[PDB]
Design a protein around this nucleic acid. Sequence first.
DNA 1: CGGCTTTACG
DNA 2: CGTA
DNA 3: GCCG
Length: 331
Amino acid sequence: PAYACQRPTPLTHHNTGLSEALEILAEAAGFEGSEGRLLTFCRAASVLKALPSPVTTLSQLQGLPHFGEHSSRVVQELLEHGVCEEVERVRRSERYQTMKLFTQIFGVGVKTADRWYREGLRTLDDLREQPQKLTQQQKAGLQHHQDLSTPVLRSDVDALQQVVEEAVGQALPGATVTLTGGFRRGKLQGHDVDFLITHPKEGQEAGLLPRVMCRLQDQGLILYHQHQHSMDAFERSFCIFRLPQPGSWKAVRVDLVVAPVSQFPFALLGWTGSKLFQRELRRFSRKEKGLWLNSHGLFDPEQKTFFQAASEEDIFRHLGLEYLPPEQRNA
DNA sequence: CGGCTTTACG
DNA sequence: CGTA
DNA sequence: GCCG
Ligand SMILES: Nc1nc2c(ncn2[C@H]2C[C@H](O)[C@@H](COP(=O)(O)NP(=O)(O)OP(=O)(O)O)O2)c(=O)[nH]1
Ligand SMILES: [K+]
Ligand SMILES: [Mg+2]
Ligand SMILES: [Mg+2]
Ligand SMILES: [Mg+2]
């Protein structure tokens, strides 16, 4: 199928080297402001992730969506020689390495990274030498960069889920906490931990994060937090937690999002990802079904009505798609 | 060409 | 501009 | 970069 939401995409697969190479080119395209090329290379990579066995010959690419001349050439060289010269050229280029370093800082996007690169900056120390030019978010991302570069593990997730569950339960009787993001899709490692919070009585979830954050801050667990007030915007908090470790601690990015229970299935679907799965699903909804999907709902612009969903299964059914559990959304 | 997910908040 |  |  042409859309990633039409096919199961497991976390581990049979074309790891080929997908890795295409995702290098996708990332590099993004660094150069070519978001169309990034999307195609990402889609091509995801098609290989969905295949039931390894690609060993070029003919297997015939008929595969999103494989044109460029993506096919990359696979051809990897099959024939074990490397793709274009990919290796990107890997060792100063532009790619610096843009990857900068864009992985919390608070730095492609545009900021590119400006810093054009200004001649190249290292984290170059950034630190002019703290007056950094936002508070970027200061926090640099302050904690080493820890934030360290993979978050399942044991960290379990520990953070307990402290968030404890704080949410202290802030609002009856509130629930659901692990979302990459760990819900079965990832064993990740860049952060994402939690979705709700309450079974519509409206009772309002005003929750300030209470949650105060209780976390009084335990000394919050190194950074950025709160966004709240339906078409959820209350959200992008945090850096201080996570205890044997004899020490490490900083961990944690995202908290609160949804009213009426919108919980849409929030869970959106925050579970993957990012490409989400994009593909929303593209499918609009272009194939004429319905507008976001993290709050599913809108019929002809009838001018929102679909009330009680589950992710409801949403897949309303879109005419076979249900995919989170572990098969690893597009 | 025209499109490419989503979009309020800080 | 940045954040999911 | 690929699709229509
Ligand atoms: N609308 C929108 N949703 C996004 C975007 N990026 C991600 N999402 C959605 C889809 C994402 O799955 C979800 C959580 O975002 P992460 O925590 O940044 N990523 P994940 O947990 O998958 O992996 P890891 O943390 O290990 O890097 O938010 C975006 O630019 N826009
Ligand atoms: K970043
Ligand atoms: Mg173009
Ligand atoms: Mg995450
Ligand atoms: Mg996150």
